[PDB]
Design a protein around this ligand. Structure first.
Ligand SMILES: N=C(N)NCc1ccccc1CCCCCCCCCC(=O)N[C@H](CCCCN)C(=O)NO
Ligand SMILES: [Ca+2]
Ligand SMILES: [Ca+2]
Ligand SMILES: [Ca+2]
Ligand SMILES: [Zn+2]
Ligand SMILES: [Zn+2]
Length: 171
């Protein structure tokens, strides 16, 4: 696995997130659910937990945008770049932006928000891209991915636990 230069990481266990805006592609509940599920994937392999804020500045600010949207990395329209996130830290760091020129769906008919979100939260937590072709952190989306068999690879777990450690206990 790979981390960010300087190995940035959250210095606290209880993190907060907030959905800044909503895409027209899906109903609000579908967006909230996808994000919650993406966060759950990581909470179960670390001693971290997440709480939602509806106002103010949360650690992880989530939003949808198109083309130029404020940062040094404008989106490219439909296809190619699907989203991007920033390493742990204050301000824009830890935030995740989704390209709304993509057709976000709850399933795989279009671009599954859950899968992409899970990958982005990986960056928000301090993980960069992996060369391991089975890792969630390997930068490649495929429409034929089977959601029912989704799970983190050992490379993703090793990586995230090298930063925050494993959960205090297990079933
Ligand atoms: N087959 C495997 N292992 N797939 C994982 C994987 C494993 C298990 C289940 C699903 C997936 C796919 C998750 C989707 C990951 C996103 C795919 C990358 C799309 C292109 C993109 O948006 N790239 C930017 C890079 C921007 C750089 C611009 N210079 C990025 O990465 N942002 O975060
Ligand atoms: Ca932030
Ligand atoms: Ca795009
Ligand atoms: Ca869209
Ligand atoms: Zn952005
Ligand atoms: Zn990525």
């Amino acid at each position: 696995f790979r981390t960010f230069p300087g190995i940035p990481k959250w210095r606290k266990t209880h993190l907060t997130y907030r959905i800044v805006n909503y895409t027209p592609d899906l109903p609000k509940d579908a967006v909230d659910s996808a994000v919650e599920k993406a966060l759950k994937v990581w909470e179960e392999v670390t001693p971290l937990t997440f709480s939602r804020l509806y106002e103010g500045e949360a650690d992880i600010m989530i939003s949808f945008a198109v083309r130029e949207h404020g940062d040094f990395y404008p989106f490219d329209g439909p296809g190619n770049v699907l989203a991007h996130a920033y390493a742990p830290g204050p301000g824009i760091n830890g935030d995740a932006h989704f390209d709304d020129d993509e057709q976000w769906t709850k399933d795989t008919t279009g671009t599954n928000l859950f899968l992409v979100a899970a990958h982005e939260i990986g960056h928000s937590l301090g993980l960069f891209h992996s060369a391991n072709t089975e890792a969630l952190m390997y930068p490649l989306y495929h429409s034929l991915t089977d959601l029912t068999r989704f799970r983190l690879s050992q490379d993703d777990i090793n990586g995230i636990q090298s930063l925050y450690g494993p959960p205090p206990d297990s079933p």
